Design a protein around this ligand. Structure first.
Ligand SMILES: CC1(C)CNC(=O)c2sc(N)nc2C1
Ligand SMILES: [Cl-]
Length: 130
């Protein structure tokens, strides 16, 4: 219905806002663009499901997220990919893992505080009815 299209549009507006606040954070600059296969040739082979904040933005506009759960799945994916690909004890790896976890935590914290549970519930029930 027209009412349901309004709900998903509100969701997309909310998700764009959250993602923008993550993307401008200097700690998360590394997660703002896809991995360059030139600088990093073995990434695409090791990480089967690449994800970054620019791709998240693209998926929002393509109406790929009907719930915040769908959205958070991709956020978690950005984090889990970073932990998997950079697992060593060296400072370089430990820094990006720390930043990855901070990205995940920040996203969840923003949503915990600003997302209405009834709004999310409505999104889920509309989604489950399709
Ligand atoms: C450090 C880098 C070159 C490779 N290792 C990574 O974890 C990622 S994930 C991403 N979106 N960019 C990079 C850049
Ligand atoms: Cl909301």
């Amino acid at each position: 219905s027209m009412q349901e299209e309004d709900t998903f549009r509100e969701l997309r507006i909310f998700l764009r806002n959250v993602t923008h606040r993550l993307a401008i954070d200097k700690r998360f600059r590394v997660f703002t663009k896809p991995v360059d296969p030139d600088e990093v040739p073995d990434y695409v082979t090791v990480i089967k499901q690449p994800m970054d904040l620019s791709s998240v933005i693209s998926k929002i506009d393509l109406h790929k997220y009907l719930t915040v759960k769908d959205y958070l799945r991709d956020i978690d994916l950005i984090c889990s990919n970073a932990l998997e690909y950079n697992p060593d004890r060296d400072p370089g790896d430990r820094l990006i893992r720390h930043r990855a976890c901070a990205l995940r935590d920040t996203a969840y914290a923003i949503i915990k505080e600003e997302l209405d549970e009834d709004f999310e519930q409505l999104c889920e029930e509309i989604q489950e009815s399709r």
